[PDB]
Each structure stands twice: as structure tokens, then as C-alpha cells.
């Protein structure tokens, strides 16, 4: 299909927020903490609710949404998880992943806590609602789950990327597992066929936190309007010619390589700039626990060394006390 990037329903870094402290074209409520690079929808404190929605409603028939997010927890159990909504009205606050219940639209829930006790969490659940069906919070929406793939998105070394596409009334969710630094490495999760959603509505994201606590970061949100090749009018008369394209593209490439060569000799010319590896950033929970045990053994090591030198000292004292009497 043909994709057009719609800026009014999108945000990304590294200049996500303005000087006022708010995200342009987006309204945030609850405990969301927008930063220069990411938006922390729900921090790692107890009972935190946050949501970021769009101001203007989006009128699309076929759209694509790319969400880059991270869910980080100290333990192996997540708090609530994220929720991506395409709704009719902005539910700024509520008990369903930090958003109001009884919504009219579609919602993808990245549930990370098993309320039902089926040991099937974390899982990605697509739920459509007409505005009169309550969400089964105590059962993770098992009855209302249109399509549910089981995937882990917590404590991944790389940010988890998801792509939700509405095209010919078919909702396709394709999730990058966050194991590789490559962007275009999406792996299929689920699809829902013949789902009716409102023609116009608000795009939003939300997060909540229960007993345990997770950090719910959202790094980027990209919205693409999708049009069929036959439906979109080409209108080639507005284009001037390919001659200007051929005259500009090679000079753009030449400028790029000239700037690269210009920066090459001054990247190492000034030694003030320093890098930092990202491999040591990632560490598994079990690896961290084993490292904690190994670090705790050092106190025993040092105490044994001190005891050994004290025993040696008392041995020397006895040796020098042997010859005093005779």
C-alpha cells in the first residue's frame, strides 16, 4: 500500500518536549512524566496511572501505528502493562490500564500481570468495544480476547517495537521482540478479521501500576495513513521533471560524503568526546541475582583473610614467647 506519515498524531525524540514541558499535539494526564527523549507513562512507584492522548481526532479508514516502548522491572513480575487505544473520546483517567472503561474503539493491551492465574502472562490482547462492554480486569479479558499472542516484552536489551495496521477492516499486530538493534525486524503476533471501529477517533497510549511496579517508557509513536494504490490519485502534473531530481540527488550524496569526511578528522581531533558501550546496560534478573551473591561472598573472603593474618600474628607472638623462659 501507500503510506503517508501524519505528524499531528506522532511524537519522537530527541526533542520530544518543548520549553513549556508538554508534548506538541498531545495531551498527557495522570502520572505521565514526559522527557526530552521518552515519555514515562507510569513510573516504578505504587499505584501510578498515566495516559497520553491526541488533541485532534484522526479521520482515517486505513492506518498504521508504530510504537516503540520499554517495560522495565526489578523483579520477574510486571505491574499492569501498556495499552494502545484508538477510541472515540479521550478517556484521560480510569482503572483500565490508567484509562477510563467502556470505550468505543480498539485497544491493544500489553498485559504483564496474570490476574486470572493461568500463567499465560505477559500477553498481548486485542479488544474491540462498542462502549457498553466492561473490561474483565480480574481475568485479563480472556472472554473478550479477539486475538492473543503470548510474548515477553519486559527487560529486553533493546526497545520493543510494535506495528498495528488497520487495512481493509483487518487489524494486524506485528511485534519486534526487542532482541536485535535492527528496526525492520518485525515478527508477526496476531490478526483480527472483519472488525468494525469508529471512522474518527483519538489515538492514545496509557499505563498503570498495581501491587508490583514497572517503568513504562514510550520512546516514539509514529502514525501512517494507508491508501490503496488504485484509490490514491497519482496526479503527475504537479511534478516538474526528473532532470532536477538527477541534478539534486548526486549533489546531496556528495554533500553527505563531504560532511562525513569533514567530521572524520575532527571526531578524533578533540579528545573531549567519549563513548559508552550499551552491552553492559542489559543484565538479566537471574544474572543480577547471581552477581549479587558473588558480590556478597567478598565480605566472607575479606573476613577470612583478616582472621588468617591475626592467626599468623598470634603464631609469631607464641614463637617469640617460646625462647623467653630458657
Amino acid at each position: 500500500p501507500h503510506r503517508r506519515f501524519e505528524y499531528k498524531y506522532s511524537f519522537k525524540g530527541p526533542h520530544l518536549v518543548q520549553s513549556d514541558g508538554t508534548v506538541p499535539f498531545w495531551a498527557h494526564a495522570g502520572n505521565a512524566i514526559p522527557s526530552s527523549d521518552q515519555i514515562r507513562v507510569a513510573p516504578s512507584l505504587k499505584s501510578q496511572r498515566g495516559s497520553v492522548w491526541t488533541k485532534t481526532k484522526a479521520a482515517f479508514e486505513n492506518w498504521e501505528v508504530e510504537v516503540t516502548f520499554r517495560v522495565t522491572g526489578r523483579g520477574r513480575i510486571g505491574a499492569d502493562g501498556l495499552a494502545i487505544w484508538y477510541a472515540e473520546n479521550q478517556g484521560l483517567e480510569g482503572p483500565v490500564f490508567g484509562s477510563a472503561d467502556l470505550w468505543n474503539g480498539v485497544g491493544i493491551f500489553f498485559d504483564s500481570f496474570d490476574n486470572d492465574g493461568k500463567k499465560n502472562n505477559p500477553a498481548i490482547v486485542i479488544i474491540g468495544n462498542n462502549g457498553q462492554i466492561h473490561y474483565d480486569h480480574q481475568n485479563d479479558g480472556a472472554s473478550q480476547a479477539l486475538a492473543s499472542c503470548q510474548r515477553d516484552f519486559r527487560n529486553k536489551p533493546y526497545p520493543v517495537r510494535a506495528k498495528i495496521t488497520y487495512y481493509q477492516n483487518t487489524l494486524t499486530v506485528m511485534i519486534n521482540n526487542g532482541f536485535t538493534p535492527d528496526k525492520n525486524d518485525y515478527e508477526f503476533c496476531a490478526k483480527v478479521e472483519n472488525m468494525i471501529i469508529p471512522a474518527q477517533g483519538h489515538f492514545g497510549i496509557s499505563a498503570a501500576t498495581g501491587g508490583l511496579a514497572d517503568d513504562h517508557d514510550v520512546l516514539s509513536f509514529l502514525t501512517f495513513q494507508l491508501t490503496e494504490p488504485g484509490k490514491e490519485p497519482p496526479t503527475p502534473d504537479k511534478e516538474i521533471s526528473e532532470k532536477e531530481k538527477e541534478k539534486y540527488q548526486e549533489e546531496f550524496e556528495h554533500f553527505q560524503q563531504e560532511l562525513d569526511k569533514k567530521k572524520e578528522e575532527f571526531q578524533k581531533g578533540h579528545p573531549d568526546l567519549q563513548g559508552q558501550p550499551a552491552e553492559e546496560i542489559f543484565e538479566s534478573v537471574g544474572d543480577r541475582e547471581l552477581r549479587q551473591v558473588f558480590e556478597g561472598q567478598n565480605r566472607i573472603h575479606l573476613e577470612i583473610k583478616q582472621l588468617n593474618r591475626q592467626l599468623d600474628m598470634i603464631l609469631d607472638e607464641q614463637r617469640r614467647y617460646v625462647s623467653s623462659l630458657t
Binding site: 503510506r3 506522532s10 513549556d20 539534486y248 569533514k262
Partner: protein, 100 residues
Amino acid sequence: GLDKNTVHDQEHIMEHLEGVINKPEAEMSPQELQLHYFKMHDYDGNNLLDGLELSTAITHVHKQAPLMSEDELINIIDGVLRDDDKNNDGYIDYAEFAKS
């Protein structure tokens, strides 16, 4: 609103290239400085400009000034995208950018 004189400003690009590249030049060609503008304002590294990067370019803070309202920003960016972007891809390429 992304005028011909707005891009053709040596002071802004000289301030932007400060720190990242330690090559302060005296005078540059208009095409060279517009190339510097296009390459520096592309944060994502896709060699493309979109609404978010243009919004960052317009609402800018150097080293006071009041912030532009949302409606003016939306109108300016919509006009720029309607005038310059002809392929209806949502992005602005250098070939599309060189017209204005």
C-alpha cells in the same frame, strides 16, 4: 514560516555546527548552507524531513522569546507540506526542499 531568508542565515547554522564539528567557515554557498540546514535538522538520520523535525526547526530556543501557539504551528507546517511535498509521502526530500 520557513522563508527563503530564514534558511539563508549564516548565524543559525554556525551556532548549530558549533561543538559537533570544529570547522568555523567564513562564507559558504547558498546551496551549501541549505544542505547544512537539511542535514543538521534531520535528527532521525533518514535524509528526510517531516512534520516533527520541521516543528523542532521552527519552534527553536537559542541562547526569552514566547512560544508559538499550536494553531500557528499546525497551519505553517500544513502549508509547507502542501506546497513542497508533491509525492504525498508525508516526508520532505532534498529535491522537494530545494524548490523553496
